[PDB]
Amino acid sequence: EAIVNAQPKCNPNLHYWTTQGAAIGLAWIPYFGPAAEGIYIEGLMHNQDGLICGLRQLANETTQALQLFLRATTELRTFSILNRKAIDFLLQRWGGTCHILGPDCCIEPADWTKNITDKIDQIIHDFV
Amino acid sequence: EAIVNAQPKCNPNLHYWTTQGAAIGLAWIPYFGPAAEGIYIEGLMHNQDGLICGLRQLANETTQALQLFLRATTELRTFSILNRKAIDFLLQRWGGTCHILGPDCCIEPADWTKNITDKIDQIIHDFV
Amino acid sequence: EAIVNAQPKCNPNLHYWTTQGAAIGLAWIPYFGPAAEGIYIEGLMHNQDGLICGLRQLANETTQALQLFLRATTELRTFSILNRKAIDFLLQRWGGTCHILGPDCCIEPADWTKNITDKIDQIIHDFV
Amino acid sequence: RSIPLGVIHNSALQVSDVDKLVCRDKLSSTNQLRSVGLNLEGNGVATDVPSATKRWGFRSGVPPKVVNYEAGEWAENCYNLEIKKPDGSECLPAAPDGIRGFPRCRYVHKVSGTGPCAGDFAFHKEGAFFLYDRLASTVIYRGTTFAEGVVAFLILPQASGYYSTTIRYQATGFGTNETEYLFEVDNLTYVQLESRFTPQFLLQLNETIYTSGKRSNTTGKLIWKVNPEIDTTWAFWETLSFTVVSXXXXXXX
Amino acid sequence: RSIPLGVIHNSALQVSDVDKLVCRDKLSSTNQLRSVGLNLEGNGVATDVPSATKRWGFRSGVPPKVVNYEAGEWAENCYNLEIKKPDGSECLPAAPDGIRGFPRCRYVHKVSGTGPCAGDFAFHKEGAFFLYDRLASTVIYRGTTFAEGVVAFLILPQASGYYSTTIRYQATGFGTNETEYLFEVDNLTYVQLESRFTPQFLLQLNETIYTSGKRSNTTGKLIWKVNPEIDTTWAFWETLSFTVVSXXXXXXX
Amino acid sequence: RSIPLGVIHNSALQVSDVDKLVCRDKLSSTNQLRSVGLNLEGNGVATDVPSATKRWGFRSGVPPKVVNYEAGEWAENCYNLEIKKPDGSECLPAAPDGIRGFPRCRYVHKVSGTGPCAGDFAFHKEGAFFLYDRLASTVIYRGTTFAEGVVAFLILPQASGYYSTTIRYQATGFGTNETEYLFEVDNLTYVQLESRFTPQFLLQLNETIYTSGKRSNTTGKLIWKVNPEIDTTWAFWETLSFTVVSXXXXXXX
Numbered sequence A, B, C: 001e002a003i004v005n006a007q008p009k010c011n012p013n014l015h016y017w018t019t020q021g022a023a024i025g026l027a028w029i030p031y032f033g034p035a036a037e038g039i040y041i042e043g044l045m046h047n048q049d050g051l052i053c054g055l056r057q058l059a060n061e062t063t064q065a066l067q068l069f070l071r072a073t074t075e076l077r078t079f080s081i082l083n084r085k086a087i088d089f090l091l092q093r094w095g096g097t098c099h100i101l102g103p104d105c106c107i108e109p110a111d112w113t114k115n116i117t118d119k120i121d122q123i124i125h126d127f128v
Numbered sequence D, E, F: 001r002s003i004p005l006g007v008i009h010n011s012a013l014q015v016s017d018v019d020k021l022v023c024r025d026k027l028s029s030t031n032q033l034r035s036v037g038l039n040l041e042g043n044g045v046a047t048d049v050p051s052a053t054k055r056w057g058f059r060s061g062v063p064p065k066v067v068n069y070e071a072g073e074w075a076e077n078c079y080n081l082e083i084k085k086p087d088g089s090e091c092l093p094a095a096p097d098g099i100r101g102f103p104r105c106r107y108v109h110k111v112s113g114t115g116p117c118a119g120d121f122a123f124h125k126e127g128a129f130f131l132y133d134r135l136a137s138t139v140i141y142r143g144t145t146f147a148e149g150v151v152a153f154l155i156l157p158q159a160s161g162y163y164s165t166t167i168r169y170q171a172t173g174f175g176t177n178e179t180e181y182l183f184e185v186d187n188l189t190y191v192q193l194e195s196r197f198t199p200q201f202l203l204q205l206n207e208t209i210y211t212s213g214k215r216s217n218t219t220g221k222l223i224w225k226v227n228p229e230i231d232t233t234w235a236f237w238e239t240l241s242f243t244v245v246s247x248x249x250x251x252x253x
């Protein structure tokens, strides 16, 4: 589905913070490095392609499924959601036998048709 | 191996409980939803194909390996066993180079033989 | 990169300990089995191929990236580094469409060239 | 040893592993992987409190371990232990954060009392687990309802009413060869417990004691005894007068 | 319900999942997967302390749950709660190990006071989360700065200065229909709080009180009131004299 | 920075990553991935207690972090610290649940004493880790034996007797430039410690003190001093008379 923002308002700019990378000198050593308050980088994203307003709606609509997932787990703190998505991505494409040219099978023999279409000019090319 | 139940007895029916899904109204909001006692669904499975009696034997026989795994880990609570099985499944099939038609290689070129067996009727079909 | 040990010294032998396996009798039952002090096996590896001295340098050089990773995570105890490496290995090889004979595509049609190179002797072999 | 995985092939349950599957076997989602806890009850073990407690023992030097499981079996018999030493110190640790009682128990056998408790943690002597709410532990937690059981791991093929009754007991010499149990009717009326006694017999005898009015009517402790003549009882799924003769002993003939 | 995943297609954000992608979609690294916390602020919700607190409520029987997120939005408004019962017992639990305040807050609305707190934990009545430092919780922790928000999950396509100000309030009847708030100027000078009052108006009025010298100059408590005549105020990103008339009441006209 | 991975190619150890392997490289099981802790000892660092403690320092504002490792190296030298402030408050936190001492230590250097401890946690000044039982921490825990070391990650190619001795020390001004150490012979006999002193020399001198009978024979504290004339000592793997002259000072010539 495409995402339809249906909020009272939208802040179209995302002034974000996150954690980082290539350190300077000894700054990677916990004893010498930043405190908890000083590990963050900042950036600013504008609403190109409506992605920011869409993102706000997406986070909003994610909440029900996320909460139902949290209700059903017994882990006190959940860190594995994205890793499990990565696994499920792989299982979707490669969890069974990949039938070449089938719709659920991600192998392209485009060049390898060409490599044997060039090999039609192999024997009855030179069929002297 | 096939599983041989070797228990003194077997309860052939599995009256099970688990957690669930499509919520009703506000019931997904933790503040409004069920308490810990009320998140469970129930079902009943009978012993078709001997799966219930087999399952009881399987859980029993799993215990040694499971306990040895728990002895060797330092995680206080282990949630990752099934996720690691999924990864190991993928590594078994796709962890190396997949040699087509080899026994450890799960790609079927059945249709893609047909697509070029139809292409034998390409050039010396019409070799006028 | 190849690894260059640049330490003041190197102990070329690795007298290691780790956890294990096929138990004896009841020893897998926590109630009857070893205490925390007695779950370890030991071995000794010598510096063949310079692997031990290389390993010491590798652990040393890993520290910066590892510490920066620990600074940025909020997990108190991290157990998932190797599992994530396994996932990233799979995503590298199988995360997109695999173009056969491309350099980032791990499928060998070596035998399956032979199986249809034998099939050049199919129809205009016997083209009576 | 590698942890076995249950798989359905040829209309039968097979034990296998992900390294031993054939290309026809399809795993398209982590949803196809499931962990199940199965109750020792379902294998025919005696569930009476005397038989059950002798399967548990205290041991030091072994750190507790917990593993989660996603789905479980309704239990007829669960247990909930409040054991102290003679000096009054606790024998079992408080339930860690997020560990709750087993969620489906027809009968909760709640045992309070004393024993030597000669070890830091109580383990299952047969290597089984103590099943709590979707968490399986190697050890018993204080005052937390559990079922004895074991865990299985499965690859799936891709496609009333709940009542609970607490039965209270008191125990001395818990975890030894000379353990003694009493079934609690009220805080001053008890019945000497035998392994023969089923839950429904205990609930029956309790009811008859109240209705017939044979509870203690004194400051003191009244202990009833049931002589072998009467019958009480097979697994759970396939199926008078009193005189004092003295603490205060008596007999139910 | 399966947890949705954001994906960019046709120059627009789409909601999808890994089971619904086409071979052209490429995921070559777990680095391409990202979790983001977005602030309710950015959807236009009222952020004044009276409006914000009525979105939170106490409830028992529901275990708290925590989920991590990797990246967040700078907040204009955060909250930090120290609420007790009338008998002085704490209403909120201490922050668990490793849970720190939200890292970017222009204004921290620090509320101390009392309420009945008729439940073990304070939850978001609309199902949102309390965002802390890269950890999102279903419940409020004591004395720990948070922003209200929600979490999104994304597949990426593979390719100043920080100031913070603490505004202190006192509250009675917290979490009810008859809650009353006071903005704190010093420990003996307070302003009766209205939903209309923005942070910068509060900081302005505070400054004018100090400079004009209208703080309490007594042992006793001085509460100022602001009558409706004056204007105070739109979302944050798109945009006198005093007389006593008595605790000691007064009016700012 | 991405966490490097060790791989064997061309009969040599290479540093690489899963994103930099070629199709010939085969990873068929998570069993092929291994984490190893290596001891700073094996790189030639001084292991005497004076040299070792100056590599550690207290710091506030940095949350502790723990990472597991699966396999380790037998240590000649481990350390176990019980440090308090002059006012008697603990400098180091109790070991968290499930964190045990390093499992293989020929010598455990157990240090008790005092220092200012001007920071919430003790970190490694060179960025190394404190290795415990299959858990590596950025910080030191109280009374918990550790080895200094670092962690490596490997892709494998798919294919006696344990003795330990506790050496006890007392310290003043711990973690400063004016730290002083005493080797403990009994609770009333001590030897002033030098960086030159190896474990076996300390155990030797201890034995000679007992056998020659030069322990304190008084209520008071006897401190022996070893003047530079005698030799004590190279890495661990490649290789008299006493007179009082006074607390009670003396000299071992």
Ligand SMILES: *[C@@H]1O[C@H](CO)[C@@H](O[C@@H]2O[C@H](CO)[C@@H](O)[C@H](O)[C@H]2NC(C)=O)[C@H](O)[C@H]1NC(C)=O
Pocket (backbone or CB within 6 Å): B006, B007, B008, B060, B061, B063, D043, D125, D126, D127, D128, D150
């Ligand atoms: C798995 O099933 C077997 C068979 O029922 C159990 O074997 C019992 O083992 C205990 C000791 O651990 C003995 O006291 C019993 O006499 C055995 N019974 C039989 C019939 O042999 C075994 O305990 C079960 N494993 C677990 C972990 O529950």
Ligand SMILES: *[C@@H]1O[C@H](CO)[C@@H](O[C@@H]2O[C@H](CO)[C@@H](O)[C@H](O)[C@H]2NC(C)=O)[C@H](O)[C@H]1NC(C)=O
Pocket (backbone or CB within 6 Å): A006, A007, A008, A060, A061, A063, E043, E125, E126, E127, E128, E150
């Ligand atoms: C997602 O967005 C919708 C729309 O803004 C929110 O809907 C509100 O829901 C609460 C009750 O939960 C009502 O009191 C409001 O009146 C609703 N607003 C509108 C405009 O309908 C919804 O709460 C948001 N979800 C979360 C988890 O924040």
Ligand SMILES: *[C@@H]1O[C@H](CO)[C@@H](O[C@@H]2O[C@H](CO)[C@@H](O)[C@H](O)[C@H]2NC(C)=O)[C@H](O)[C@H]1NC(C)=O
Pocket (backbone or CB within 6 Å): C006, C007, C008, C060, C061, C063, F043, F125, F126, F127, F128, F150
């Ligand atoms: C990795 O090895 C290098 C080289 O041995 C270590 O470099 C030392 O760094 C400390 C400061 O961190 C200095 O005081 C030493 O003088 C350095 N020694 C040399 C020979 O240069 C480095 O510390 C090691 N890293 C870790 C994390 O142990």
Ligand SMILES: CN(C)CCCN1c2ccccc2CCc2ccccc21
Pocket (backbone or CB within 6 Å): B016, B018, B041, B043, D034, D071, D156, D159
């Ligand atoms: C989905 N709700 C309503 C029913 C769950 C029943 N369900 C169960 C029951 C117990 C454990 C796991 C599972 C997974 C789904 C599955 C697949 C095949 C047969 C039974 C089951």
Ligand SMILES: CN(C)CCCN1c2ccccc2CCc2ccccc21
Pocket (backbone or CB within 6 Å): B014, B045, B051, B052, B055, D006, D007, D008, D013, D034, D036, D071, D154, D155, D156, D157
């Ligand atoms: C009825 N058919 C089609 C579904 C069987 C699913 N079933 C399965 C599936 C695979 C292996 C064993 C078992 C035992 C029964 C059990 C218990 C809990 C959840 C799932 C399962």
Ligand SMILES: CN(C)CCCN1c2ccccc2CCc2ccccc21
Pocket (backbone or CB within 6 Å): A016, A018, A041, A043, E034, E071, E156, E159
């Ligand atoms: C890397 N430092 C310096 C910038 C991070 C900006 N970065 C961000 C910003 C917020 C969350 C995740 C990410 C991942 C990297 C990515 C990819 C495309 C556009 C923006 C971003």
Ligand SMILES: CN(C)CCCN1c2ccccc2CCc2ccccc21
Pocket (backbone or CB within 6 Å): A014, A045, A051, A052, A055, E006, E007, E008, E013, E034, E036, E071, E154, E155, E156, E157
């Ligand atoms: C600018 N272009 C090219 C990068 C967009 C990355 N962007 C993405 C990427 C995919 C889906 C949604 C969004 C919303 C914006 C957001 C916020 C935090 C981190 C990454 C992202």
Ligand SMILES: CN(C)CCCN1c2ccccc2CCc2ccccc21
Pocket (backbone or CB within 6 Å): C016, C018, C041, C043, F034, F071, F156, F159
């Ligand atoms: C299996 N028991 C008995 C021996 C373990 C030795 N083993 C070791 C030793 C230390 C860490 C990991 C590993 C994995 C197995 C491996 C592979 C190649 C050479 C050595 C090792």
Ligand SMILES: CN(C)CCCN1c2ccccc2CCc2ccccc21
Pocket (backbone or CB within 6 Å): C014, C045, C051, C052, C055, F006, F007, F008, F013, F034, F036, F071, F154, F155, F156, F157
């Ligand atoms: C002897 N050959 C064949 C096995 C080498 C395994 N070995 C390996 C394997 C790959 C890379 C480095 C290293 C260093 C030695 C080390 C230490 C602990 C466990 C495994 C390993």
Ligand SMILES: *[C@@H]1O[C@H](CO)[C@@H](O)[C@H](O)[C@H]1NC(C)=O
Pocket (backbone or CB within 6 Å): D165, D166, D167, D168, D203, D206, D207, D210
């Ligand atoms: C025993 O019987 C009394 C009498 O009705 C009842 O109130 C009590 O709950 C019963 N106890 C149990 C454990 O069933």
Ligand SMILES: *[C@@H]1O[C@H](CO)[C@@H](O)[C@H](O)[C@H]1NC(C)=O
Pocket (backbone or CB within 6 Å): D177, D178
């Ligand atoms: C049985 O009890 C006796 C005490 O009467 C005790 O000495 C003996 O050790 C017990 N037997 C076992 C097997 O524990």
Ligand SMILES: *[C@@H]1O[C@H](CO)[C@@H](O)[C@H](O)[C@H]1NC(C)=O
Pocket (backbone or CB within 6 Å): D187
């Ligand atoms: C019975 O005793 C327990 C504890 O000894 C107590 O909590 C309970 O209230 C008592 N019941 C009655 C009816 O006195």
Ligand SMILES: *[C@@H]1O[C@H](CO)[C@@H](O)[C@H](O)[C@H]1NC(C)=O
Pocket (backbone or CB within 6 Å): D213, D214, D215, D216, D217
């Ligand atoms: C009940 O009480 C009477 C007097 O109150 C006493 O004589 C009698 O023995 C008691 N009987 C039972 C069964 O408790």
Ligand SMILES: *[C@@H]1O[C@H](CO)[C@@H](O)[C@H](O)[C@H]1NC(C)=O
Pocket (backbone or CB within 6 Å): E165, E166, E167, E168, E203, E206, E207, E210
């Ligand atoms: C209110 O004004 C005083 C006067 O300068 C200032 O010191 C104080 O920090 C201000 N308080 C807030 C919450 O801004």
Ligand SMILES: *[C@@H]1O[C@H](CO)[C@@H](O)[C@H](O)[C@H]1NC(C)=O
Pocket (backbone or CB within 6 Å): E177, E178
């Ligand atoms: C509003 O407050 C009144 C008290 O004046 C209370 O009785 C009523 O329940 C409250 N309304 C709601 C919806 O809580």
Ligand SMILES: *[C@@H]1O[C@H](CO)[C@@H](O)[C@H](O)[C@H]1NC(C)=O
Pocket (backbone or CB within 6 Å): E187
């Ligand atoms: C105001 O009161 C709080 C607690 O009541 C106290 O911690 C603070 O020091 C006080 N401030 C002044 C200036 O007295």
